[PDB]
Scaffold this active site. Structure first.
Site, PDB file in Angstrom:
ATOM      1  N   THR A  91      39.407  39.881  55.791  1.00 33.14           N
ATOM      2  CA  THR A  91      39.125  39.692  54.181  1.00 33.14           C
ATOM      3  C   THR A  91      38.823  40.840  53.476  1.00 33.14           C
ATOM      4  O   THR A  91      38.235  41.803  54.071  1.00 33.14           O
ATOM      5  CB  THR A  91      38.086  38.458  54.177  1.00 33.14           C
ATOM      6  OG1 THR A  91      37.850  38.238  52.667  1.00 33.14           O
ATOM      7  CG2 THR A  91      36.789  39.129  54.595  1.00 33.14           C
ATOM      8  N   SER A  92      39.444  40.998  52.170  1.00 32.73           N
ATOM      9  CA  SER A  92      39.001  42.204  51.390  1.00 32.73           C
ATOM     10  C   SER A  92      37.763  42.207  50.786  1.00 32.73           C
ATOM     11  O   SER A  92      37.507  43.241  49.952  1.00 32.73           O
ATOM     12  CB  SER A  92      40.191  42.016  50.117  1.00 32.73           C
ATOM     13  OG  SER A  92      40.214  40.792  49.565  1.00 32.73           O
ATOM     14  N   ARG A 128      55.373  27.877  50.432  1.00 32.52           N
ATOM     15  CA  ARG A 128      54.304  28.496  51.068  1.00 32.52           C
ATOM     16  C   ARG A 128      53.848  27.462  52.203  1.00 32.52           C
ATOM     17  O   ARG A 128      53.440  27.884  53.463  1.00 32.52           O
ATOM     18  CB  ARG A 128      52.839  28.735  50.139  1.00 32.52           C
ATOM     19  CG  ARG A 128      52.966  29.805  49.110  1.00 32.52           C
ATOM     20  CD  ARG A 128      52.344  31.249  49.761  1.00 32.52           C
ATOM     21  NE  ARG A 128      50.900  30.980  50.109  1.00 32.52           N
ATOM     22  CZ  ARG A 128      49.882  30.487  49.233  1.00 32.52           C
ATOM     23  NH1 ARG A 128      50.233  30.436  48.098  1.00 32.52           N
ATOM     24  NH2 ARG A 128      48.673  30.469  49.874  1.00 32.52           N
ATOM     25  N   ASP A 168      41.538  48.104  57.263  1.00 33.41           N
ATOM     26  CA  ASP A 168      41.157  49.017  56.046  1.00 33.41           C
ATOM     27  C   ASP A 168      39.622  48.768  55.880  1.00 33.41           C
ATOM     28  O   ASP A 168      38.935  47.836  56.231  1.00 33.41           O
ATOM     29  CB  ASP A 168      41.929  48.390  54.824  1.00 33.41           C
ATOM     30  CG  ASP A 168      41.994  49.140  53.698  1.00 33.41           C
ATOM     31  OD1 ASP A 168      42.254  48.861  52.477  1.00 33.41           O
ATOM     32  OD2 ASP A 168      41.233  50.382  53.498  1.00 33.41           O
ATOM     33  N   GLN A 224      38.521  31.699  54.252  1.00 32.70           N
ATOM     34  CA  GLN A 224      38.946  31.298  52.860  1.00 32.70           C
ATOM     35  C   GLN A 224      40.408  30.879  52.909  1.00 32.70           C
ATOM     36  O   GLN A 224      41.148  30.786  51.843  1.00 32.70           O
ATOM     37  CB  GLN A 224      38.994  32.741  52.244  1.00 32.70           C
ATOM     38  CG  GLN A 224      37.498  33.118  52.266  1.00 32.70           C
ATOM     39  CD  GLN A 224      37.545  34.812  51.704  1.00 32.70           C
ATOM     40  OE1 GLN A 224      37.308  34.929  50.561  1.00 32.70           O
ATOM     41  NE2 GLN A 224      37.260  35.543  52.940  1.00 32.70           N
ATOM     42  N   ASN A 225      41.199  30.750  53.993  1.00 29.98           N
ATOM     43  CA  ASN A 225      42.584  30.534  54.234  1.00 29.98           C
ATOM     44  C   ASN A 225      42.878  28.903  54.004  1.00 29.98           C
ATOM     45  O   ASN A 225      42.135  28.257  54.316  1.00 29.98           O
ATOM     46  CB  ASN A 225      43.147  30.822  55.725  1.00 29.98           C
ATOM     47  CG  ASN A 225      42.876  32.481  55.939  1.00 29.98           C
ATOM     48  OD1 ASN A 225      42.676  33.237  55.231  1.00 29.98           O
ATOM     49  ND2 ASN A 225      42.903  32.591  57.262  1.00 29.98           N
ATOM     50  N   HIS A 239      38.297  27.423  50.157  1.00 24.57           N
ATOM     51  CA  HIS A 239      39.365  27.218  49.072  1.00 24.57           C
ATOM     52  C   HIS A 239      40.408  26.341  49.127  1.00 24.57           C
ATOM     53  O   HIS A 239      41.445  26.414  48.543  1.00 24.57           O
ATOM     54  CB  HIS A 239      40.063  28.759  49.071  1.00 24.57           C
ATOM     55  CG  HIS A 239      39.178  30.015  48.799  1.00 24.57           C
ATOM     56  ND1 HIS A 239      39.369  31.289  48.869  1.00 24.57           N
ATOM     57  CD2 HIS A 239      37.883  29.826  48.414  1.00 24.57           C
ATOM     58  CE1 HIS A 239      38.622  32.187  48.839  1.00 24.57           C
ATOM     59  NE2 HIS A 239      37.376  31.523  48.184  1.00 24.57           N
ATOM     60  N   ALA A 269      42.822  41.827  63.621  1.00 23.27           N
ATOM     61  CA  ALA A 269      42.155  40.968  64.336  1.00 23.27           C
ATOM     62  C   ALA A 269      42.741  40.518  65.646  1.00 23.27           C
ATOM     63  O   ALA A 269      42.115  39.966  66.415  1.00 23.27           O
ATOM     64  CB  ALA A 269      41.991  39.700  63.382  1.00 23.27           C
ATOM     65  N   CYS A 275      51.876  11.012  41.621  1.00 26.84           N
ATOM     66  CA  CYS A 275      50.479  10.199  42.385  1.00 26.84           C
ATOM     67  C   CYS A 275      50.920   8.597  42.411  1.00 26.84           C
ATOM     68  O   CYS A 275      51.375   7.890  41.299  1.00 26.84           O
ATOM     69  CB  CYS A 275      49.441  10.395  41.640  1.00 26.84           C
ATOM     70  SG  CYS A 275      47.927   9.214  42.190  1.00 26.84           S
TER      71      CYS A 275
HETATM   72  N1  LIG Z   1      46.262  41.944  61.246  1.00 27.81           N
HETATM   73  C1  LIG Z   1      45.208  42.065  60.433  1.00 27.81           C
HETATM   74  N2  LIG Z   1      43.924  41.854  61.059  1.00 27.81           N
HETATM   75  C2  LIG Z   1      42.850  41.671  60.165  1.00 27.81           C
HETATM   76  N3  LIG Z   1      42.978  42.008  59.025  1.00 27.81           N
HETATM   77  C3  LIG Z   1      43.991  42.363  58.261  1.00 27.81           C
HETATM   78  C4  LIG Z   1      45.304  42.348  59.313  1.00 27.81           C
HETATM   79  N4  LIG Z   1      46.248  42.622  58.258  1.00 27.81           N
HETATM   80  C5  LIG Z   1      45.564  42.729  56.930  1.00 27.81           C
HETATM   81  N5  LIG Z   1      44.286  42.618  56.934  1.00 27.81           N
HETATM   82  C6  LIG Z   1      43.191  42.813  55.847  1.00 27.81           C
HETATM   83  O1  LIG Z   1      43.099  41.358  55.545  1.00 27.81           O
HETATM   84  C7  LIG Z   1      42.541  41.725  54.388  1.00 27.81           C
HETATM   85  C8  LIG Z   1      43.335  40.475  53.250  1.00 27.81           C
HETATM   86  O2  LIG Z   1      42.584  40.528  52.113  1.00 27.81           O
HETATM   87  P1  LIG Z   1      43.319  39.480  51.041  1.00 27.81           P
HETATM   88  O3  LIG Z   1      44.948  39.370  50.930  1.00 27.81           O
HETATM   89  O4  LIG Z   1      42.611  39.614  49.670  1.00 27.81           O
HETATM   90  O5  LIG Z   1      42.978  38.132  51.633  1.00 27.81           O
HETATM   91  P2  LIG Z   1      41.401  37.143  51.377  1.00 27.81           P
HETATM   92  O6  LIG Z   1      40.156  38.171  51.614  1.00 27.81           O
HETATM   93  O7  LIG Z   1      41.362  36.161  52.493  1.00 27.81           O
HETATM   94  O8  LIG Z   1      41.700  36.508  49.655  1.00 27.81           O
HETATM   95  C9  LIG Z   1      40.714  35.868  49.190  1.00 27.81           C
HETATM   96  C10 LIG Z   1      41.245  34.985  48.604  1.00 27.81           C
HETATM   97  O9  LIG Z   1      41.724  35.474  47.209  1.00 27.81           O
HETATM   98  C11 LIG Z   1      43.112  34.993  47.117  1.00 27.81           C
HETATM   99  O10 LIG Z   1      43.297  34.916  45.948  1.00 27.81           O
HETATM  100  C12 LIG Z   1      42.768  33.879  47.733  1.00 27.81           C
HETATM  101  O11 LIG Z   1      42.523  32.821  46.872  1.00 27.81           O
HETATM  102  C13 LIG Z   1      42.045  33.923  49.027  1.00 27.81           C
HETATM  103  O12 LIG Z   1      41.952  32.936  49.809  1.00 27.81           O
HETATM  104  C14 LIG Z   1      42.867  43.058  53.841  1.00 27.81           C
HETATM  105  O13 LIG Z   1      41.681  43.541  53.649  1.00 27.81           O
HETATM  106  C15 LIG Z   1      43.574  43.544  54.854  1.00 27.81           C
HETATM  107  O14 LIG Z   1      43.371  44.708  55.068  1.00 27.81           O
HETATM  108 ZN   LIG Z   2      46.471   9.566  40.655  1.00 25.63          ZN
END
Ligand SMILES: Nc1ncnc2c1ncn2[C@@H]1O[C@H](COP(=O)(O)OP(=O)(O)OC[C@H]2O[C@H](O)[C@H](O)[C@@H]2O)[C@@H](O)[C@H]1O
Ligand SMILES: [Zn+2]
EC number: 2.3.1.286
Length: 249
Positions: free
Chosen positions: A186-187, A67, A213, A98-99, A116, A229, A145
């Site tokens: 974000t979802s 990653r 979505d 959250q990234n 996060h 985005a 460490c």
């Molecule tokens: N090109 C794009 N532009 C904008 N949004 C997009 C795009 N492509 C996909 N998405 C949207 O991004 C969202 C991503 O959702 P997640 O994969 O759940 O990411 P996130 O909301 O940041 O996750 C929350 C957190 O959970 C994880 O476990 C992790 O820890 C993370 O930080 C989705 O709703 C999706 O539709």
């Molecule tokens: Zn240590």
């Protein structure tokens, strides 16, 4: 994308943003949920969990090393650049994300809160020691460490773990002073991040959601742009900059 939306942004007094994995998708970095989502392939309970890390640290580290290399070798996309520009223009006051990637920073964003954690950070599992890395480590061997005698772990927050008190408090202070919040990529299911936009709304502020979505936040989003985005933010900031240039000052 109407004039009301452009006005809401351009005339905002304190605009902030909350971003998720979707804003980095156009940089070649996979999201967690949805099409090609990491959680649709891999299992979080075995890779992003303290128990999973204690059970098989090598398996977890190899996955994170992968990653990390991916993110470190990726380039910021048009969405990252747009958020940076919106900040340069003095409109965006703070970007909450959250990234765990550092693409907002590499695009030039200055005020960024990492709810996060970050892939750039590695910390000790026992002693209070952490630092940043320039490139991904090679696994094996397991990262240790130097301060004491224990293994290092990625400096990200896993499900079940608590966000640093100061980090969440800072983010909350930001949304408590904002009149507009752009929620992109974000979802809206993971807490407490998903609750931040609600504070702005409960305060009478406006929510601008950008996502291909619909999400649990869509019903209360003043505006919800169903697109990527990169495309949406680029056009948005271009129009905002034009509007600001017309201001008599
Ligand atoms: N090109 C794009 N532009 C904008 N949004 C997009 C795009 N492509 C996909 N998405 C949207 O991004 C969202 C991503 O959702 P997640 O994969 O759940 O990411 P996130 O909301 O940041 O996750 C929350 C957190 O959970 C994880 O476990 C992790 O820890 C993370 O930080 C989705 O709703 C999706 O539709
Ligand atoms: Zn240590």
């Amino acid at each position: 994308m109407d004039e009301k939306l452009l006005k809401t942004i351009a005339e905002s007094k304190y605009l902030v943003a909350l971003t998720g994995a979707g804003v980095s998708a156009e940089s070649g970095i996979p999201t967690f949920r949805g099409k090609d989502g990491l959680w649709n392939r891999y299992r979080p309970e075995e890779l992003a969990n303290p128990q999973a890390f204690a059970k098989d640290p090598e398996k977890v580290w190899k996955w994170y090393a992968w990653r990390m290399e991916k993110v470190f070798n990726a380039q910021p996309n048009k969405a990252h650049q747009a958020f940076a520009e919106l900040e340069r223009l003095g409109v965006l006051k703070c970007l909450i994300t959250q990234n765990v990637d550092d693409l907002h920073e590499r695009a030039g964003s200055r005020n960024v809160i990492h709810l996060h954690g970050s892939l750039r950070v590695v910390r000790c599992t026992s002693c209070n020691n952490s630092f940043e890395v320039e490139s991904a480590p090679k696994i094996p061997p397991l990262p240790k460490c130097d301060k004491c005698g224990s293994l290092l772990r990625p400096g990200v927050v896993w499900a079940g773990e608590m966000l640093p008190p100061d980090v969440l408090d800072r983010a909350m202070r930001e949304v408590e002073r904002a009149d507009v919040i752009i929620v992109a990529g974000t979802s809206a299911v993971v807490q407490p991040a998903a609750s931040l936009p609600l504070i702005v709304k409960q305060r009478g502020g406006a929510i601008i959601e950008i996502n291909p979505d619909e999400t649990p936040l869509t019903p209360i989003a003043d505006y919800s742009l169903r697109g990527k985005a990169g495309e949406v933010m680029d056009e948005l900031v271009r129009h905002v900059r034009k509007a600001l240039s017309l201001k008599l000052n």
